[PDB]
């Protein structure tokens, strides 16, 4: 636009491009997403401005001009992804794992109760401060990574839950505890046999109605579930316990952020700050 100048791209999602931006009136730093051009999600959105909570990136003002819709939002200093990797030698301290999963797990309890999902969690959409807070962005309407894809999704469900997220976020904490991709699938069978590699192929047992689901092929090879203390050894058992659950394959057996929340794991939470290097 005109009223902003733009200082730098930051990112590219599958709708549009965000830039780091200038107000050139107010002065004010932000984070600008272009999207390159309906009457419905217009309401879906502009609802998504009444959103407040500490751990939601707050979306300032919502333009539709010239077949462009831009989101203006509150702009952070540094995304998950980018953080992960500058803390790959050493690894992210258990204490701050703790904070980051814990505070996402109230911005999650608070979409859900507002219900709202996100979809597409990952890692270069959780973006944190110097003080230590991390905030869910870039909100997911109704290469593409697949690693933190639900199996429900893979399979072909036609409606999504809020249990999608769930799993999300499972994967992104233990990719903060092993400093490996939990599951880096490349393709959506790929994603999807990595995914029964590990946790074993589900059947009518443990997720029942599974077989009769959109994707599902009888012809899916029969793998047995690995033990999880190889998943994320250095987890301790509250950890590993709490990531299980965040991981079921029924998603209606899969954990609620609220419930998440009140896991032992949490007892001893507080929040570091982090060394940022902006
Ligand atoms: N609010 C906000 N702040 C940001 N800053 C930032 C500062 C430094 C870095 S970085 N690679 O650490 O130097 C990264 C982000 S982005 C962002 C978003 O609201 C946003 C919008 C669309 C997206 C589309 C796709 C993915 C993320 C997205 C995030």
New binding site residues.
Partial sequence: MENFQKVEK????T????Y?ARNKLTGEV??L?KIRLPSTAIREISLLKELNHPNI?KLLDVIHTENKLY?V???????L???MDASALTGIPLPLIKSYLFQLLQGLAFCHSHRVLHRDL?P??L?INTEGAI?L??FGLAVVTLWYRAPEILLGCKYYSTAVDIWSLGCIFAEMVTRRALFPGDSEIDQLFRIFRTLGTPDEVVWPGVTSMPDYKPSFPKWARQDFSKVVPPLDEDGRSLLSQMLHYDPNKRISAKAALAHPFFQDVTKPVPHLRL
């Fill in positions: 930051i990112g590219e999602g709708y549009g491009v965000v780091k932000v984070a997403k990136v989101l939002f509150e702009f952070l200093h540094q995304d992804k980018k953080f990952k270069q959409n973006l905030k962005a870039d």
